[PDB]
């Protein structure tokens, strides 16, 4: 869930 900033699965 880190949307844009990267960690798009957490």
Request: proline share 0%; glycine share 0%; charged share 0%.
């Amino acid at each position: 869930x880190x949307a844009s900033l990267x960690x798009a699965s957490l």
